[PDB]
Each structure stands twice: as C-alpha cells, then as structure tokens.
Ligand binder design. Structure first.
Ligand SMILES: *[C@@H]1O[C@H](CO)[C@@H](O[C@@H]2O[C@H](CO)[C@@H](O[C@@H]3O[C@H](CO[C@H]4O[C@H](CO)[C@@H](O)[C@H](O[C@H]5O[C@H](CO)[C@@H](O)[C@H](O)[C@@H]5O)[C@@H]4O)[C@@H](O)[C@H](O[C@H]4O[C@H](CO)[C@@H](O)[C@H](O)[C@@H]4O)[C@@H]3O)[C@H](O)[C@H]2NC(C)=O)[C@H](O)[C@H]1NC(C)=O
Ligand SMILES: CC(=O)N[C@@H]1[C@@H](O)[C@H](O)[C@@H](CO)O[C@H]1O
Ligand SMILES: *[C@@H]1O[C@H](CO)[C@@H](O)[C@H](O)[C@H]1NC(C)=O
Ligand SMILES: [Ca+2]
Length: 1319
C-alpha cells in the first residue's frame, strides 16, 4: 500500500495543555474561567500526569459543576481538537516578552509571579516589598484578551505561570480582594519554562493531490487512471446511484469523493443505472439547478468562503444559545427551527428589503410649500415627446422614456411672493441675480427692486403687494406651513434629507448614486404592473408609490441608517429581573380581545423630568384606544442616591385607576402624593436590568415586543400618533409573519396572552441579527445521520458527486455529524453537462471531532494520509488552507510539484512519502476609508510596529476596497503612517478593530491577533487642515545591496537552473548583489541549500510573499498563479526601502555586470522590458505578434519579453501602476481565453496607459528568434521554447552555452561537500 503523508506545524511553540484547556473551556464566559481557576488553585489538577488524564479530568468537572451539558461538551472536544485557544495564549506571551520584560526594573529571581499596582511590582502576596518603577506605556489599558473579575476603584494585574504550585496563594489574595470590592482582578500569562520548545501541530486545513497531465481523453487496487471517450455525462448520475445502493451511504461518498479520479473507469458496473429516482428530476426542476452545491444551517445559506472549521464552531455556539431560549416555552428543536425558517417569516424579510416611502405632497400644506422645479406635460421641452404610458412600459436599457435660518425666512417670503403674482422666471431671476451680485442669503432690496423693475412681466391673477413683506397670511401661513413640511418629514438638521419618490436619501457624499439606483428600481417596478394591466391610461405615476406611504416620518422608528436596530430577549427579561418586573405598574391587556390585537409594550422613563412623564401620558393615551396592548412603566431616574422604588410604589397603588386621567395633571399629582418605604431589593434588580440592557440613567426608551427605540431626548419626538405607527409597522414585519407561520404548524395553542406572544416574536427577530427545500421529495436521493428528535442543529447539504468543491464539503460535514445534538440530511444532484473531466484531484481533510492521544498519553499530531495512491500518475501537492493563513513547505526530500511513486521507489527504495509544511504567518488585513467623504486612499504607506521594534512590517494602500495586509503571528501590534508624504497629508483617527462603526471606544490604533482567523480591520483616515494634495503630486543599496534581482522556480530542474543563474551574475560582477525569491513556490531542498550558496558566492538573500486577495480573481492552474505573482503585486511584494528590482527568469544565464541595467535611464517610465528578436531570417512564420489580434492592438508598439525586466519601484509606487494592472486583469479575466501568458500579455496590453521603457537588444538572446551571428554581442540568454523542435531545456543549455557545465560542476561539488556534514 503506497502512501503519502502531509502535516502542518505552527511558527510558535505549543503552550502547556493545562492553560489551553482553561481557555478552550471558558470561550468567553468569565464565570467558567475563574470558577475553573479556583479548581486548579486547590492543587486539584496537579494529580493528572498526562495530557489525556488532564483532558479526562476536565470532562467530569464541567459536567459535575453544571458548566456544560452533553451538547456543549461535544462542542468543547471539537474546539479543543482545533486548538483554537493556542494563539490566544501566545498573544499573552508575545505581549509579556516585548512590553513587560524590557520595562520591568529589578532582578528577576524568585519573582515567578507578581502583581502590578501603581507602576510597582510586588513579588509577594503580603505586599511588603516593591522591586520597581515600571517604564514604558500604560499597561492598565483593557485590551482584547483581558478578563475582569469584580468591580474596584483600584486596578490589580497578576502575571502568573499557572503550571507551578507557587501560583495558588497569590490568586486567592486578589480573588478575595475582588470579592470584597477593594479592586478589580485580572490575569495575564507568563511563558512557563517547565514546558519544552516543541512546535505546535495544527489542523482544520485540506490537502489536494492534483493530476498535472489532464490531456488524456479521446475494482480495487489500480496502477494509473484509464481515460475513456466522451462518456463523461453519466459519471455524476451513476456515482450518485452507487452511494444510494451501498446502504452505509455517508461512508461511501467520503471514500468515493476522496479518491474520485481513480474510480472513474470503476463506475458503470453491475447493473449500475437503477433509476428508481426518476421522480426526483422534478426536485431539480423546481428549486436548484443540477450539479450545484448548496449548504444550509437552520435555514442559513452558506457559500464556500463561509465554510471554515473555525467560523463554523462559532455559528453552532451562537445558534444553540438562540434555540435553548426558544425551547423554554415548550417547543422541540424541530418545531423551533421550522418556525424560524417558515415561508411567511422569510417573506417578511424580503418584504422589508423593499423600501417604505413617505408622503412628500403639498396637500396638507394646501399646495403652497414646494416649488415644482420642472413639469413634463407643460414645459415645451419634453411636451411633444409622446405623452403615453406605453412609452415607459416598452423600454429596455439605461435610456430615459419621456411623457431654517433668519435669511432663509425672508428670502422664502420674497421668492414665494414673486412666484404668486409675477411668475417662476421672475423668482428665478431674483435667485440668479442674488447669487452673482450679492453672494449671500440675506434679503437685498437694492437687488430685489431691480428684479421688479426688469422682470415685471404682467403680474396677473391676485394683484401685487409691492416692495415690503409682512403679510399676515403670506408671512404667517406660507412660512409656517413650510416649517410644518420640514418638521413632518424630519428633512432638516445637521444632515438634511432628500426625497426621491417618497424615499429618504440624506444629503451626503454621493446621494445621486443612491438616487440612480432607486430610479432604475422604480422603473422596473412600474413595467411589471403595466404588463399585468394593473395601471390605467389616466394616471398620475408618483401616486403608485404613495399607496402605502405614511404622512409623518419618525427618525427613531425609521432610521436612515438601516443597520440601526436593537431587540432584547423578552423571556430573559422576565426571569432575570423577576424581582423588578413583578413590582412594576402593569396595565394588563384586555382578555376579551383577539390574538391579532395582542402586543406587549414597556416604557422606560425618568419621571423626575417633564419629558419622562410627558412620554408616559402619551403611552397611557395610546393604551385607552388599543385594548390589546399590555403596558409596563418601571421608572429610570437620572438622579442617584434617591430611591427609584418610591415613585414606582406611588403608581402601583394607582395601578387599578391608571388611564382614568382626564387631564395630564392627574398623572402629575399621582406621582407626588403618598408616603412610601424604599424597597431596596427592587432598586438592586432595577440597576441590574439597565446594565444587562445597556441603558444609561435618566434616559427615556420605548420597548414594543422586544424592539427598543431611544434614547428619547424630547417627548415631543414620541407622541400618541408615533406609538400607533410604531405598533402598525412592527406588527406588520414581526408579529403578523410569526402569527401565520405559528398557526400553520399548529403551535397557536402556546400563545396565552400579550406577554406570551412577545417571547416568540422577540426571539425570531433576534435570529436574523428559509425552508424552501422542504417541498422536495427525499425518499431516493436523501439520507439522514443523527437523531432528529433530539438535535438542535439541522444541516441540509445539496452536493454534486462530480464536483471538486464537494470533496471538501463531505469531509468537513462528516466530522460535524459526529457531534451530539446535530442532525444532517444530504441530497445528491449531478449534472449531465460534462465537457471535460469532472474531478482532477485527490482530497483529504485534516480534522478530528475529539482529541487523539498517544500510547504515552501525549496529544497526537494530525496529518493527511493518502493510502490509495496510483504508482504511475504524476501528482502535485497543494494546500487548501483557511484564508488568513500563509503556508510553505519546510520538510520534504522529493519534488512536491512532480510526484511519482515509481521513481521514488526506484531512487529512495520506499513507496511512502512524508512532507511537512509550516504555518509561518497569519494575516492582519483591513479595508481603509477617508473621512468624511469616504473613499479609498491609494498610495498611502503604512508601518506595523511593536514595543521592541518600531518597524515590524510595511505595506501600501490599494485602490480596491482600500485593501492592505501584513504577515504576523499572535501578539500586540500598532499601526503608524509611514514618515514622509503620508503623515504630511493624513492623520489616522482609528483602526477599525470593533467594526465598520464608529463604535464608541474604538479611537485606537492598536491591533492584536489571538485567533486562527487573523484580524479584520476597517481603519479611518482624515485629511489634515485644508488639503486636496496627493502622494503622487508635489506640495536601498546600504540596506540591501548594489544590485537587487528577484526570481521564481517551480521544479527541481528550474531550481537547479536558478543556482546557475545566480552564479553567472557573481562571476561577472565585482559588486554587491542581493537575491529575492517568491517564498511559497520553492522546495525545502532549495530553501535549506541557499545559506551555503550565500557563503560561497558572497551574496545576501531574502524571502518575500503576499497572499492573493479575496476580491482579486483566482487562478485554478498554478503556472498561471506564478505568472500573476511576477506582475500583479510588484508594489506590495517588496519593502518600501528598496529603490529598484530586476527580474531574471530561472533558465537564464548572464555574462554582463548587472549594474549597467540599474544605471540605465528609463525616461520617466516605471518599468523596462526587452523586445522580441527580429535577427533570425527564416523564423518569420511563427512570429505570432505580427498577426491579427496582436498587430491590430500593437499598432506601432513592440511585443516585449517577460524573461528579463527592470522595475523602478519608487516610480512604480508613485505612478500607482499596480492598481491599474490588477483591475484590468480582473476585468479581462472574465473571459477564460483572455491571456495566454498573462505575464507578457498584461504589460503589452497596458503599454499605452503605462509607459514601458524599451531595452537594447544586446540584453536578450534566444536561438529560436536571434541569429547565431548575434550571440557575440549578447548580454544574457533565456533558452526560449522550441516551438516546432523536440529538444529539451537540459539539451539546449549544454549545446548553446559551453560555460553552463562549469557553473553546474561548482554547485555539484558544493552539494556533495554539504552532504557529508550529518553522520
Ligand atoms: C456562564 O457559565 C455558567 C456555568 O454554566 C452559567 O452560570 C450559572 O449557570 C447555572 C445553570 O447552568 C445557574 O444555575 C441554574 O439555574 C437554573 C434556573 O433556575 C432558577 O435559578 C436561577 C438562579 O440559579 C434564577 O435566575 C431563576 O430563579 C427564578 O426564581 C427565583 C425565585 O426566588 C427568583 O428570585 C428569580 O428572579 C427567578 O425568577 C431560575 O429560574 C436551575 O434550573 C439550575 O438547576 C439545575 O440543577 C441541576 C444541575 O446542577 C439539574 O439537574 C437541574 O435539571 C437544573 O437544571 C441551576 O440552579 C447559575 O445561577 C448561573 N450562575 C451565574 C453566576 O450566572 C452562566 O449562565 C454562563 N453564561 C453564559 C453567557 O453562557
Ligand atoms: C568590475 C571588475 O573590474 N571586475 C574584475 C574582473 O573584470 C576580473 O576579471 C576579476 C579577476 O581579476 O576581478 C574583478
Ligand atoms: C414528489 O413525488 C411525487 C410522487 O411520489 C410526485 O408526484 C411529485 O411531483 C414529486 N415532487 C417533485 C417536486 O418532484
Ligand atoms: Ca530563462
């Protein structure tokens, strides 16, 4: 059985297992954390000798103390396997090593643990002696990995090595100190020297074995893949049946999908067709197309990018908390999910995606407020352009079908008057003259009188009123009616509001862009009504939108920031604060009212303020009208030290008599009368409620069915009419869809009142901040795993057996199916359209559902082991790693790009291959924006730093999404703008570590990574005083080497040729040279060899890499990836400190001193290339760059070669050439046959937009296109492809160049010299 084994190890040592289990066990719950910290401080976990025993002990403890149930325990095992907590612990260590140790005064011997109080270190719990005054920045800032126990004026921090017994007494000193309330307690970690410096073995990634020869196409134990004629069509269909027939189908799919290329000809055997599933063709015809992969998690639709083990563990965790909340009202997990993803519920989300409009009309203000800028039927511009509705309906494309302040008050009077008697043009005239001549809003009669004198065009109708305005009706009615319009729709303030077809669009940045989007969306909405005959010939088009429009607009109910929405769990509120909610004044909703009428309202208000008590009167008024509402009042006062229980006690006595207040003073007087004893138990539950609900003191809030609006600054903002619309809108979206769906399932017996109903509606709203597949028959295409009756998690997978994406999905889903309380149901849907081979690779996923232990009890390493490997097939090893990870090969003796078992058996003697990779870096990536006119600042330079070193890394901001990235490991970092033009123009207020926001408390520039998902940021940069400047326009040798050359090689041969290339440079120059390599495409054999090349030849080297952005279009073929790396990331791949770089292609040899290329002036161009040889006389026919596409495009410009080129990096960055290359590539890449060789084709396609300096032809020689006479004056040779010959590259080198062997001999003896340095 010939096998292949691949493993991955992290760039940091494995933290002690004990501390890892503490962190994994208490994911984010602090009570579990310190409750377990007590247990290990007893010395309770000291008797467990091995990792297995230690793990075993935690299971009994968590179960016994009530921390976890079976479902949460199973989730703990999987998260523990994933080693999710390891980077979180390493964050503590990096912080401790880089900021604590260099800032700590005093000798450290005996000070294993020590509290830090007021910049003083105490090595003893008794606090007798202080060793030092700690230097550096403030350590008391609360950062992401911190935990706090208790509230205290003083802040105490304990840096402990938990492993030893010396920890226990220190802990108890501050645990009790926090329990009393003297100070707040928090624990930080210290690197424990008891543990070894062994690296960490990781999992949650995939390995692929790609077939590199796919040209072929016209039982167990196979030698090679046999290719067949165009009978591919049945592969998916027959493959799907095989599984159904097996009767252990889950295992069959995994076994088939992992080694699929090998089983191709093995399919179609033993009466294979068996189309019993002929009824399920209707399944594919009604909902999803054939061959498509779709996954659902309790209705939630997931794409491939969202399917990572780390991200999926967090989804289950969030989902269980949500469902447990539901099943406290007697609902099964099955009933609960069914209600959440019900059709009537999903319809409401789509319904509220469709915007609601507001009545912008003059009708209320008697038509004397808004000035109609244009008129389509009476303007004499559009008049004759067909006045028909069918002109609008019969349309396609993007064409147009046709048919506050004092000065403002005065100028409104002026314009209004001037319009009324004289007309629009005369009013227009005043405005235009005022703009140029006076240039201010202030009323000018010197300018006004001139307008009456010139534009006095027959003022008909009502007579003129002359020069001065103070009209009792004109000034009063018109101006105050205008104010009533602005107020009604909240169209003023700091940010005014524009209304397009009754849709509010705030006057900010690119509102026209938003307007255009709705303009097209409204047009398509009209067309569909017209085709169905909904519309008629005599109709006003704007009134179709005004059908459901509301007259008044409340910014609280309908915020312009559509994200702004907050809902609380109602069930939680009445069990957490039962002491409070059983003593609040409650007006029960009438029992003799209907379920549809039912709703639950709670008003939180400061009754010691006029606004707070005004708001309650309106709520009481609203309750008289609506018999179905159940009201609560509570009382939240701003003033502290005065008991809130007294005013609540005043009202609960009058509770029976509530809403019998003929006038407002009756409520005012009820608050003042009565003598009461403060229930201090009530006061305690009251302040706990506000803390849980994140509410401040003296702030007014309104809660209907869990949804909260507030804080209410003025009670005039929320009136009786505002409660009615709030109930109307809320009712529609959340209450009505819950009621229908609930009744359809037959759960409408569980609703016993308004409070009972609110629990359900409030929970379903929290779920989003579909069950369309239940229509499908399941008998012949589906299979289930896990108990549906007990399961809380329901997975629905729709996998196509012939897909490569399916390979990953099955492997991950099998491990998640092993969890207790999870149900999985699978659908197989293949395609009949198979033009090429469906799966061209073997796949294995490294993941375990529970930790694995050694024979010695240690934690087992996790690996991808392939056991069904064909001996004669050429394979490529690839890593399918989570997006935040950067991975390279570290240990391998064979060529991972060219694997063959028969050659390894004939050279090494073994049919078993082992390779190890390294998770070298984890990404810090973000999306930047300018402030306040938010756009991507391109060309901006950034620096990442740490307290130890102020220059960890550097990158530049991209145009697309303001993208940037850094390569880093767990720890505390900071982002500063690079010294120069960047800091001159900008200042960055924040790095968006909390979200898009701004969330309060995020005015920070600190970044920390404590997860395998890296760190996602949304930084903000605001321009410095009065700047419209750009980093482009006016207001390396010492660091690296004389010459900087970069290259890339794929195979052992290309790496061997790369060794020759570097040597030829060295022999041919008495200068300093530095070599740069694209790190991830090189072999470990080459990687381990270079220091020996560097010692012999006297050069410097540096490994560089960049991770292919998620937005940027991928390359499925690795050779295409390599080409992209040479052209797409030139500006970001190399550090800012380097002035220029030169690319030389691996199969090249150089006879010249390479400095000359540096000194060559590039005539203000960012990069320079050499053209194709014309010298060969008889080669012409195969010169394709003088034909059709290339000759039409390159009218006079040359066809350049990407074998050798210069990049003036400083100018490249300055010109921002990279951004243009990237977006043109992405745009061109939609067509698959777009770039044959992108590396050559992209600079050639961009040479008119981006200048290309052309090089002397002395710089390149190739036998194929240059004459033999030419080689005497040749500087460098590429070894250009045949193309009509058969001689290989090894042959050309020895025949074409005689000194090639001399270079090869030097490397050969050195390799042997190195080989004898191991026994
Ligand atoms: C962080 O992790 C910890 C640990 O898991 C969680 O903290 C603790 O969780 C446990 C549950 O695992 C809590 O105790 C349980 O409480 C339930 C509920 O019953 C009643 O008791 C509550 C107080 O314990 C109280 O809030 C409610 O009481 C009502 O009635 C009183 C009447 O006087 C009234 O005053 C209140 O206002 C309430 O109206 C509540 O109804 C209880 O059922 C549990 O008993 C279990 O016992 C065994 C297991 O030992 C089991 O066999 C039984 O079936 C039963 O289920 C248990 O007492 C504990 O109070 C929590 N402590 C803290 C500090 O939180 C924490 O919730 C996690 N947080 C997060 C975010 O995950
Ligand atoms: C730039 C320069 O002068 N380089 C010289 C080279 O020409 C000479 O062949 C070699 C051996 O003497 O020493 C060095
Ligand atoms: C489900 O199966 C029945 C026969 O049992 C068939 O009539 C029906 O059309 C099928 N539905 C779909 C969507 O294929
Ligand atoms: Ca070459």
């Amino acid at each position: 059985s010939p096998s292949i084994n691949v493993a991955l190890k992290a760039a940091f040592p494995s933290p002690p297992y004990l501390v890892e289990l503490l962190e994994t066990a208490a994911s984010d719950n602090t009570t579990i954390y310190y409750s377990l910290l007590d247990r290990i401080a007893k010395g309770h976990f000291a008797e467990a000798t091995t990792d297995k025993a230690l793990y075993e002990k935690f299971l009994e403890v968590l179960r016994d103390d009530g921390h976890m149930d079976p479902e949460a325990l199973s989730a703990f095992k999987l998260a523990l396997s994933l080693r999710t907590a390891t980077p979180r612990v390493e964050a503590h260590y990096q912080y401790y090593t880089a900021t604590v140790e260099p800032s700590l005064s005093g000798t450290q011997e005996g000070c294993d643990q020590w509290f830090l109080i007021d910049g003083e270190q105490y090595c003893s719990p008794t606090l007798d002696t202080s060793h030092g005054k700690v230097k550096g920045e403030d350590q008391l800032r609360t950062l992401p990995f911190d935990r706090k126990f208790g509230v205290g004026s003083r802040d105490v921090i304990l840096y402990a090595d938990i492993t030893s017994k010396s920890f226990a007494p220190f802990h108890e000193v501050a645990m009790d100190l926090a329990k009393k309330g003297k100070a707040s307690y928090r624990v930080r970690y210290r690197r424990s020297p008891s543990h070894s410096r062994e690296s960490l073995s990781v999992n949650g990634y995939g390995v692929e074995l790609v077939l590199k020869r796919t040209d072929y196409i016209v039982e167990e134990i196979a030698d090679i893949k046999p290719l067949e004629k165009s009978e591919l069509a049945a592969l998916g269909m027959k493959a799907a049946s095989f599984v159904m027939q097996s009767e252990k189908p889950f295992e069959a799919l995994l076994k088939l999908t992992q080694d699929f290329p090998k089983y191709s000809n093995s399919l179609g055997s033993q009466n294979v067709s068996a189309e019993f599933e002929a009824e399920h063709r209707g399944n594919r015809e009604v909902f999803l197309p054939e061959g498509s992969n779709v996954l659902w998690l309790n209705g939630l639709h997931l794409i491939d990018r969202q399917i990572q083990p780390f991200g999926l563990v967090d989804l289950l965790t969030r989902e269980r908390k949500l469902i447990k909340s539901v099943l406290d009202l007697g609902l099964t997990g099955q009933q609960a999910v069914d209600l959440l993803g019900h059709a009537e519920v999903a319809h409401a989300k789509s319904g509220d995606d469709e915007p609601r409009r507001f009545d912008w009309r003059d009708d209320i203000e008697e038509g004397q407020v808004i000035i109609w800028l244009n008129n389509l039927e009476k303007d004499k511009r559009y008049k004759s352009f067909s006045p028909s509705i069918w002109v609008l309906i019969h349309h396609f494309g993007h064409g147009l079908p046709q048919i506050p302040t004092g000065q403002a008050i005065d100028q409104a009077k002026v314009v209004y008057y001037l319009l009324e008697n004289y007309g629009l043009a005369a009013a227009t005239a005043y405005l235009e003259k005022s703009y140029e001549e006076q240039s201010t809003g202030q009323p000018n009669e010197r300018i006004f009188n001139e307008v009456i004198k010139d534009k006095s065009l027959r003022p008909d109708g009502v007579e003129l009123s002359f020069k001065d305005i103070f009209i009792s009706e004109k000034h009063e009615k018109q101006i105050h009616l205008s104010k009533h319009w602005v107020e009604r729709l909240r169209a003023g303030g700091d940010v005014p509001t524009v209304f397009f077809d009754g849709f509010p669009i705030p006057r900010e940045d690119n509102w026209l862009r938003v307007m255009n989007h709705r303009l097209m969306q409204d047009l398509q909405a009209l067309q569909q009504a017209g085709y169905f005959g909904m519309l008629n010939e005599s109709m006003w088009l704007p009134g179709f939108f005004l059908e459901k429009a509301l007259s008044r607009r409340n910014t609280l109910i309908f915020p312009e920031d559509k994200n702004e929405l907050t809902v609380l769990n109602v069930n939680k509120i009445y069990i957490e604060n039962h002491d409070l909610m059983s003593k609040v004044p409650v007006i029960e909703a009438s029992k003799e009212s209907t379920r549809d009428d039912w709703a639950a309202l709670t008003v939180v208000a400061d009754l010691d303020d006029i606004e707070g008590q005004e708001l309650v009167y309106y709520a009481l008024r609203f309750r008289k009208s609506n018999d179905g509402v159940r009201l609560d009042i509570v009382h939240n006062p701003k003033d502290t030290s005065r008991s809130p229980s007294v005013l609540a006690q005043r009202l609960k006595s009058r509770e029976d008599k509530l809403l019998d207040f003929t006038r407002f003073l009756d409520l005012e007087t009820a608050l003042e009368t009565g003598e009461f004893e403060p229930d201090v138990a009530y006061d305690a539950s009251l302040a706990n409620f506000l803390a849980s609900s994140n509410m401040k003191a003296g702030d007014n809030f309104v809660i209907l069915n869990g949804r909260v609006l507030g804080p209410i600054t003025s009670a005039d903002d929320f009136k009786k009419e505002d409660f009615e619309v709030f109930l109307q809108a809320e009712r529609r979206t959340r209450i009505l869809p819950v009621y229908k769906a609930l009744e359809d399932l037959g759960l409408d017996d569980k609703v016993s009142g308004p409070l009972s109903a609110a629990k359900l509606t409030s929970v379903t709203a929290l779920s989003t901040i579909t069950t369309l597949f239940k229509q499908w028959n399941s008998t012949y295409t589906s299979f289930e795993v896990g108990d549906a009756s007990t399961a809380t998690i329901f997975f629905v997978a729709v996998i196509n057996p012939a897909s490569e994406i399916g390979q990953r999905w099955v492997a991950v889903l099998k491990v998640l199916s092993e969890l207790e309380g999870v149900h999985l149901r699978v659908f197989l849907n293949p395609t009949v359209m198979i033009e090429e081979l469906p799966v061209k690779r073997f796949y294995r996923y490294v993941l375990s559902s529970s930790p694995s232990f050694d024979e010695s009890g240690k934690v087992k390493a996790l690996s991808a082991r392939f056991t069904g490997v064909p001996r004669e097939t050429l394979l490529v090893v690839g890593m399918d790693v989570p997006p935040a990870w950067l991975v390279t090969s570290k240990v391998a003796v064979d060529d991972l790009d060219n694997l063959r078992i028969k050659d390894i058996k004939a050279k090494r003697g073994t049919e078993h291959v082992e390779a190890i990779y390294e998770l070298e870096h984890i990404l810090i990536e973000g999306h930047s924006r300018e402030i306040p006119g938010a756009h991507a600042p391109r060309g901006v330079q950034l620096v990442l730093e740490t307290e130890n070193n102020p220059h960890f890394a550097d990158t530049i901001i991209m145009a697309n999404l303001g993208y940037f990235q850094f390569k880093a490991n767990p720890g505390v970092y900071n982002i500063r703008l690079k010294e120069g033009r960047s800091s001159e123009i900008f200042t960055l207020e924040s790095v968006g570590a909390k979200g898009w926001g701004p969330i309060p408390g995020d005015d920070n520039t600190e970044v920390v990574l404590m997860d395998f998902q890296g760190t996602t940021l949304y930084p903000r940069l605001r321009r410095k005083p009065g700047m419209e400047e750009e980093d482009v326009l006016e207001p390396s040798k010492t660091e690296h080497a004389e010459i900087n050359i970069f290259s890339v090689a794929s195979g052992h041969l290309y790496e061997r040729m790369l060794n020759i290339m570097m040597a030829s440079v060295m022999h041919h120059t008495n200068h300093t040279v530095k070599f740069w390599f694209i790190e991830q495409f090189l072999s470990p054999s080459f990687k381990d060899f270079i220091p020996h090349m560097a010692a012999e030849y006297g050069f410097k080297y540096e490994m560089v890499t960049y991770k292919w952005p998620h937005w940027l279009r991928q390359q499925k073929e690795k050779q295409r990836e390599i080409w992209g790396y040479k052209i797409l990331f030139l500006d970001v791949l190399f550090p800012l400190s380097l002035d220029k770089v030169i690319f030389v292609d691996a199969d090249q040899i150089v006879r010249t001193d390479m400095y000359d290329l540096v000194e060559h002036p590039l005539d203000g161009a960012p990069y320079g290339f050499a053209p194709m040889c014309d010298s060969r006389v008889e080669m012409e026919g195969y010169r394709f760059w003088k034909t059709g596409y290339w000759a039409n495009y390159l009218k006079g410009k040359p066809y350049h070669i990407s074998a050798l080129y210069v990049v003036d990096l400083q100018r490249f960055r300055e010109l921002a050439a990279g951004d243009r290359l990237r977006q043109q590539y992405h745009a061109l890449s939609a067509d698959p046959n777009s770039l044959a060789n992108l590396d050559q084709d992209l600079p050639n396609h961009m040479q008119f937009t981006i200048p290309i300096a052309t090089l002397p032809q002395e710089w390149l020689w190739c036998e194929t296109w240059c004459s033999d006479e030419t080689l005497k004056d040749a500087r460098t040779i590429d070894l250009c492809n045949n193309p009509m010959t058969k001689e290989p590259k090894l042959d050309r080198a020895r025949r074409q160049v005689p000194e090639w062997t001399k270079y090869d001999e030097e490397i050969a003896e050195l390799a042997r010299r190195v080989r004898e340095e191991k026994p």
